[PDB]
């Protein structure tokens, strides 16, 4: 019964880019898998004129089509880069979003306050929207929409995959996590969300200190669990929980069950369509580097109690393992798009493999 397959989707130096990074994975409403990541073209510019790329599988992840460009970096001055994709599917409308950085002159650290897309010293937040299953895209810079405090100096959508709430008064809400640098220079986490199917986006209340890229997941009772890397380097993930559909979070604490070397992770519902409060609705899967000292020992953990306990875990990548993102596939198995050091690798496993 156990299933664990893997195949590279992007290898550094092949298919036009010296480096590929920052995986995003999703399943379209029609059932295709989309894998996205950024390509850093040959060059020494930083932030570089990266592109957001995509590959599609129409056979459940077995084979993958040609690498396509979602957002094309501009390699001539004025330089423009697009990186760190996150997919978000509105399963009610069928629309697919791909959030990503839009860089010009400044990266994360160098960005300064401002929301004018024409300002090249701002690290901008973009989102691409597709109503045709990811074939074609329209683009928006949404920095102004998601910067309620002009003191916020910088932001990026955490690469990976966002969510749509299924439960409660905000059912249908689309939620994409961001990390920001606030006025005081702290790194905080904040949910960016839409209650109108992606027509408009806003930021919620930022939370925490020493945060980083972070992810959210809807628990069995509709609470939204936020799970962040810790830029203060505790050796663990940081967690907080929202009771208002991701708008605001309670206190942030380190989660001793989730060792982490300060690196990306993903956390998903194993049964995203399970009804509220059901046993299956309590099941979470988590992927990250379990090593506290390096980006290695990629591990999947499972919780059957809304993330309170993680009684099952298994290493999927003993070696180098940086960013990773999980998605639930229609066939009941799980896709895992991750960085083995050589680019972007796609794995598919089932719960039987987890044991
Ligand atoms: As479990």
UniProtKB/Swiss-Prot annotation:
BNR repeats lie at residues 55-66, 128-139, 192-203, 240-251, 301-312. Transmembrane segments: none annotated. It comes from the Bacteria. Induction: By N-acetylneuraminic acid, colominic acid, and sialic acid. Its main location: secreted. It catalyses: Hydrolysis of alpha-(2->3)-, alpha-(2->6)-, alpha-(2->8)- glycosidic linkages of terminal sialic acid residues in oligosaccharides, glycoproteins, glycolipids, colominic acid and synthetic substrates. Substrate binds at residues 21, 229. It is found in: Secreted. GO terms for biological process: ganglioside catabolic process; oligosaccharide catabolic process. Keywords: Glycosidase, Hydrolase, Repeat, Secreted, Signal. One of its GO terms (molecular function) is exo-alpha-sialidase activity. Coiled coil: none annotated. One of its GO terms (cellular component) is extracellular region. The active site is at residues 45, 213, 323. Belongs to the glycosyl hydrolase 33 family. This is Sialidase. The lineage of its organism: Bacteria, Bacillati, Actinomycetota, Actinomycetes, Micromonosporales. The chain holds residues 48 to 402 of 647 of the full protein.
């Amino acid at each position: 019964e156990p299933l664990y397959t893997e195949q590279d989707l992007a290898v550094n130096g092949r298919e036009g880019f010296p480096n590929y990074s920052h995986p995003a994975l999703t399943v379209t409403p029609d059932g295709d898998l989309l894998a996205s990541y950024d390509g850093r073209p040959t060059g020494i510019a930083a932030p570089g004129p990266n592109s957001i790329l995509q590959r599609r599988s129409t056979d459940g992840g077995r084979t993958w089509g040609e690498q396509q460009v979602v957002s094309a970096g501009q390699t001539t001055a004025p330089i423009k880069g697009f990186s760190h994709p996150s997919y978000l599917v509105d399963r009610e409308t069928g629309t697919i979003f791909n959030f990503h950085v839009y860089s010009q002159r400044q990266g994360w650290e160098g960005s300064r306050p401002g929301t004018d897309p024409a300002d090249p010293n701002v690290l901008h937040a973009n989102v691409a929207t597709s109503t045709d299953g990811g074939l074609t895209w329209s683009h928006r810079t949404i920095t102004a929409d998601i910067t309620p405090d002009p003191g916020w100096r910088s932001r990026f959508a955490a690469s990976g995959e966002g969510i749509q709430l299924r439960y409660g008064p905000h059912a249908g809400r689309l939620i994409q996590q961001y990390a920001i640098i606030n006025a005081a220079g702290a790194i905080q986490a904040v949910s960016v969300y839409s209650d109108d199917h992606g027509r408009t986006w806003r930021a919620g209340e930022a939370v925490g200190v020493g945060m980083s890229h972070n992810k959210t997941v809807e628990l069995s009772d509709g609470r939204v669990l936020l799970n962040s890397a810790d830029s203060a380097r505790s050796g663990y993930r940081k967690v907080a929980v929202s009771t208002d559909g991701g708008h605001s979070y309670g206190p942030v604490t380190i989660d001793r069950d989730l060792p982490d070397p300060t690196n990306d992770a993903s956390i998903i519902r194993a049964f995203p369509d399970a009804p509220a409060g059901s046993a299956r609705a309590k099941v979470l899967l988590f992927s990250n580097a379990a090593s506290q000292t390096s980006r290695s020992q990629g591990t999947i953990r499972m919780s059957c109690d809304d993330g309170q306990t993680w009684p099952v875990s298994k290493v999927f990548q003993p070696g180098s393992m940086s960013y990773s993102t999980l998605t639930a596939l229609p066939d009941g198995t799980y896709g895992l798009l991750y960085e083995p050091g050589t680019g972007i690798r796609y794995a598919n496993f089932n719960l039987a493999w987890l044991g």
